[PDB]
Write a protein that binds this ligand. Structure first.
Ligand SMILES: CCCCC/C=C\C/C=C\CCCCCCCC(=O)O
Ligand SMILES: CCCCC/C=C\C/C=C\CCCCCCCC(=O)O
Ligand SMILES: CCCCCCCCCCCCCCCC
Ligand SMILES: CCCCCCCCCCCCCCCC
Ligand SMILES: CCCCCCCCCCCC
Ligand SMILES: CCCCCCCCCCCC
Ligand SMILES: CCCCCCCCCCCC
Ligand SMILES: CCCCCCCCCCCC
Ligand SMILES: CCCCCCCCCCCC
Ligand SMILES: CCCCCCCCCCCC
Ligand SMILES: CCCCCCCCCCCC
Ligand SMILES: CCCCCCCCCCCC
Ligand SMILES: CCCCCCCC
Ligand SMILES: CCCCCCCC
Ligand SMILES: CCCCCCCC
Ligand SMILES: CCCCCCCC
Ligand SMILES: CCCCCCCC
Ligand SMILES: CCCCCCCC
Ligand SMILES: CCCCCCCC
Ligand SMILES: CCCCCCCC
Ligand SMILES: CCCCCCCC
Ligand SMILES: CCCCCCCC
Ligand SMILES: CCCCCCCC
Ligand SMILES: CCCCCCCC
Ligand SMILES: CCCCCC
Ligand SMILES: CCCCCC
Ligand SMILES: CCCCCC
Ligand SMILES: CCCCCC
Ligand SMILES: [K+]
Ligand SMILES: [K+]
Ligand SMILES: [K+]
Lengths: 262, 262
């Protein structure tokens, strides 16, 4: 009867959290959305007025452009899709459940293989993340034991959850700052935009509004892709570990509050 | 020393998997990509020649349209963003790490709150999924024990991993088929497109090329959103449980492989 109570309490808390978040976000974003819409309307009217065009023809032109931009065409020069490197970056995004959305399958037969490939790969990636977390905890315990032994001359040493959480937070902040050190001069962006992209990518959310390393020319274009791969991998591992630790702490807190409720 | 060997073997297998998948996907998609690009080029040339326009002006027009479409502006009459319900949809996609990408924050201040909200919510969602899996296993065990007891008259009854995997696969297939029964008449899609969307959404990949329930008018429009919410929640739970079970099986197989090798 305890487990059912815990499940119900968690569900209710999540629902309240969602309602509050929606209430805040609407008030934060509505006015900017409306201003952008009116700006686009005025620009469209000016363009349709200067060149004495019609209104339906521009609609057909824009529909064709939407189809083209879905295929992969963009106004600025971009790297081609579906080449060996582009396919490598697509499968890398697929197996980690990021899914930026800049490259998607378009033919029948290219979708079934996607289903089977993802089904077999996502489980392996999850197993890899779990093994990484176990190794990190073990090495932390060994380092702490060795440090204590060395300080004395002046297994059962596993650290608690709080210290693991602090270490993970510090590592994630350092990795994000180091990654945002680049991406600023290579691609024109603000530092805060780089941090926002790093958080969106590392948490495996992947909105797709900002995607890195596609400009059809990146000077060296060599070690840059390797660095991007390394940074994304490390960030994803650290963030997933942090989420698991936070979940453990939340479960302990729920246990306490339900014991208190009597 | 065994754990390090397991880690290294898993990493090597994942790398080989990625290379093979990239090769296959490129070989399947390159020609279609090239044909689409050529078609768009021909259409643009025809339009430019017909209306005696220049080439840079159309580029500026398309850049303005890209900026407008980065906001909540589409071609075929979509629902407004950030009113109250768009925010609810957005936060629902955020906390489940789907990230479709149809709605993104645009103002500074709306991004920091996103960071904190996601950091606190993703852990709770993961905990909810784990608790659901535990409850499902317990109820399966109870049902099996009760059925055996009833058949006889004509705790320690934990089912094995294989039966849990089979049950999860059957439930996921049934849920996906029932969901794809809808979305076919309400929105104009093929049945296979509905299945593809269901798999992409349930696995928390979320490419964003197909997003449901946005046309600014959906007849009843009251029960449709509730049904969409229920279906997505159930599918995500089932798929995550299946991924965890398959990961356990893969770990067992790796242990056997290491044991056999000397
Ligand atoms: C050697 C470690 C093996 C473990 C691999 C596991 C998971 C892969 C996860 C994430 C890879 C991120 C994809 C980015 C690819 C960019 C490549 C490019 O810019 O072209
Ligand atoms: C009562 C259940 C509590 C658990 C909730 C946990 C996680 C939420 C997960 C997924 C929600 C899917 C997106 C919702 C779509 C909005 C519907 C609409 O407006 O069209
Ligand atoms: C451990 C091996 C990982 C594989 C990393 C390969 C990524 C691709 C390398 C980048 C190749 C770009 C083409 C070179 C152009 C100079
Ligand atoms: C347990 C309650 C969770 C469901 C919360 C409400 C679902 C989303 C709102 C339903 C759609 C209302 C639109 C009304 C327009 C006719
Ligand atoms: C005894 C019944 C109490 C538990 C019911 C929980 C309802 C949550 C349903 C949504 C989970 C998919
Ligand atoms: C959905 C997330 C809600 C946050 C759960 C934490 C509960 C805080 C109580 C702490 C008491 C010690
Ligand atoms: C995410 C939890 C925060 C809850 C606070 C929401 C109440 C304020 C909403 C009204 C703003 C005008
Ligand atoms: C002028 C562009 C130089 C690009 C430098 C990137 C090299 C990073 C390699 C480090 C890998 C972790
Ligand atoms: C004995 C050395 C074990 C180190 C194994 C390397 C595994 C790849 C490192 C990248 C994972 C984040
Ligand atoms: C990385 C995905 C491939 C994992 C393959 C699993 C091992 C199969 C051999 C076990 C058969 C008994
Ligand atoms: C997922 C791994 C499947 C095996 C890949 C074989 C690669 C064949 C290349 C086909 C080129 C025509
Ligand atoms: C033409 C009217 C279509 C509306 C049907 C939606 C009913 C879904 C209810 C199912 C609840 C799980
Ligand atoms: C804390 C929950 C707030 C209730 C939602 C507000 C609806 C306008
Ligand atoms: C955490 C509550 C912040 C709400 C302020 C809304 C800004 C207008
Ligand atoms: C042309 C169809 C081939 C797709 C591969 C078959 C799925 C395993
Ligand atoms: C000019 C770019 C250099 C960025 C620093 C390298 C990453 C540590
Ligand atoms: C003007 C942008 C400042 C953002 C500061 C918040 C960083 C956590
Ligand atoms: C120019 C390609 C550099 C790639 C480095 C690979 C070393 C593991
Ligand atoms: C199984 C790995 C095959 C590697 C394919 C690379 C072809 C250029
Ligand atoms: C499973 C391998 C099939 C790849 C060859 C089909 C594409 C021509
Ligand atoms: C249009 C308002 C939606 C109903 C509010 C939900 C409160 C349970
Ligand atoms: C500009 C208002 C920012 C409010 C959110 C700050 C994060 C707690
Ligand atoms: C054109 C029909 C597609 C058949 C795919 C079968 C899905 C498993
Ligand atoms: C018209 C709204 C009906 C859906 C709400 C049902 C409450 C469980
Ligand atoms: C074009 C890149 C070749 C990759 C070999 C590892
Ligand atoms: C023992 C290997 C540790 C791996 C790198 C974090
Ligand atoms: C005991 C509750 C089971 C929940 C519904 C799958
Ligand atoms: C149960 C789905 C019925 C289909 C609605 C037309
Ligand atoms: K995602
Ligand atoms: K996306
Ligand atoms: K995800």
């Amino acid at each position: 009867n305890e487990d059912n109570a815990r499940f119900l309490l968690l569900a209710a808390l999540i629902v309240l959290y969602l309602l509050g978040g929606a209430a805040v976000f609407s008030a934060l974003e509505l006015a900017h959305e409306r201003q952008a819409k009116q700006r686009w309307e005025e620009r469209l009217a000016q363009f349709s007025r200067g060149h004495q065009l019609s209104r339906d023809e521009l609609r057909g032109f824009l529909r064709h452009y939407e189809e083209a931009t879905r295929a992969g065409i963009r106004v600025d020069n971009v790297r081609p899709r579906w080449d060996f490197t582009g396919a490598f970056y697509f499968v890398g995004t697929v197996v980690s459940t990021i899914g930026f959305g800049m490259t998607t399958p378009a033919t029948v037969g290219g979708k079934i293989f996607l289903i089977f490939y993802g089904l077999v790969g996502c489980s392996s990636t999850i197993l890899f993340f779990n093994l990484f977390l176990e190794r990190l905890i073990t090495i932390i315990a060994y380092i702490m034991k060795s440090c204590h032994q060395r300080q004395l001359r002046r297994a059962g040493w596993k650290p608690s959850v709080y210290y693991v959480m602090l270490i993970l937070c510090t590592a994630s902040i350092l990795i994000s700052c180091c990654a945002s050190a680049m991406y600023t001069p290579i691609e024109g962006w603000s530092y805060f935009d780089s941090l926002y992209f790093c958080f969106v990518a590392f948490s495996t959310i992947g909105f797709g509004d900002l995607v890195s390393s596609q400009n059809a020319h990146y000077e060296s274009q060599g070690l840059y892709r390797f660095a991007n791969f390394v940074f994304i991998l490390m960030g994803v591992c650290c963030i997933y570990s942090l989420f698991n630790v936070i979940s453990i702490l939340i479960k302990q807190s729920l246990n306490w509050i339900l014991r208190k409720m009597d």
